[PDB]
Amino acid sequence: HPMITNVAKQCYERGEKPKVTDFGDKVEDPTFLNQLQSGVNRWIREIQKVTKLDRDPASGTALQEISFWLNLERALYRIQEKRESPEVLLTLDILKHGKRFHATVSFDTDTGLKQALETVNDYNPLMKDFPLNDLLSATELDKIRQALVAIFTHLRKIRNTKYPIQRALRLVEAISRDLSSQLLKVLGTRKLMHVAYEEFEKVMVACFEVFQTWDDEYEKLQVLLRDIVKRKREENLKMVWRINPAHRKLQARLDQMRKFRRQHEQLRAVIVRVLRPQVFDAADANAIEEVNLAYENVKEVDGLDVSKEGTEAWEAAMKRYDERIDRVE
């Protein structure tokens, strides 16, 4: 309100903090009190717009999650600093002196500012350091594994906070989605289809090392979370996880890749051993070129496509290759 500003600058220029008495007859003015009442209503509505903010855990990346929570915490701290400023305290004091306890009690209670402030204070140490940014930056499977262990330690930080177990789990699927994205990006970059089979096996060994590290550290955090729920057994009752990491399909996809090429390579070697005459039947070259053409046909379908169209194209390629190998079988 302009009036409180004018009286406050007058009081400060007189080297004294303002007081209710300085308003004199204005303290009992009806219209001035009504204006302050409406102003406090606006303040309460604005504060409730910020305090009541809530984010769906499932939607968006964990990077978006950390940004949301830190931004909300900063906003609440700014709001709290504004709230403790002499202007708002003076306004509440004037309204109290006018017995207009509606606005004052509502501001002290309806805002919920203390509760949101406590919530973000509880949530700060868990979100203070997270390496998901570094993981998204990381471009190597070993770097990815290092990032995973760092992430799971900063998730172990949860034990001394009030973060809900469900929301932490949804954060974990957010980690899964980011991990799947980065693995897809790396394996697309290196073009695993056209490279030598041996280094290809090495890279997939690295990938399965990464998946195993994910599973092991998830198990560690899972026993930790069960212990935490035991410690708060009376408070929280919903332990249901039903975790479905996004990369899991991709893991299975990559699993298929390995066995496929493995069988293919082994089978390829065997047929090359057997069809050689005891030194050249045309049927032998027909079978060999048929196997090679089956491999090339399978190479037409991208291996990294996990979507439904990817699934159906992959299945068609596998049935085709299966028949082609059934001939030589």
Binding site: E219, V240, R242
Partner: protein, 63 residues
């Protein structure tokens, strides 16, 4: 001659830890499936008991 045997007991420790983890996870999953089915059955029983009570009241009135 005994050092390798100690390694065998270390291997057995790792094997038993893996087996225990698998078994306890499997039992937890079975437990949670049965809890979900228990909740579903409890909800069904609740709605059907509501229907029982409403029908009995209707039947008194119509009698």
């Amino acid at each position: 001659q005994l050092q390798d045997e100690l390694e065998r007991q270390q291997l057995h420790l790792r094997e038993a830890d893996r087996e225990k983890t698998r078994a306890v996870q499997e039992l937890s999953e079975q437990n949670q499936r049965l809890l979900d089915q228990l909740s579903r059955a409890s909800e069904v029983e609740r709605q059907l008991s509501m229907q029982v009570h409403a029908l009995k009241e209707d039947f008194r009135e119509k009698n």
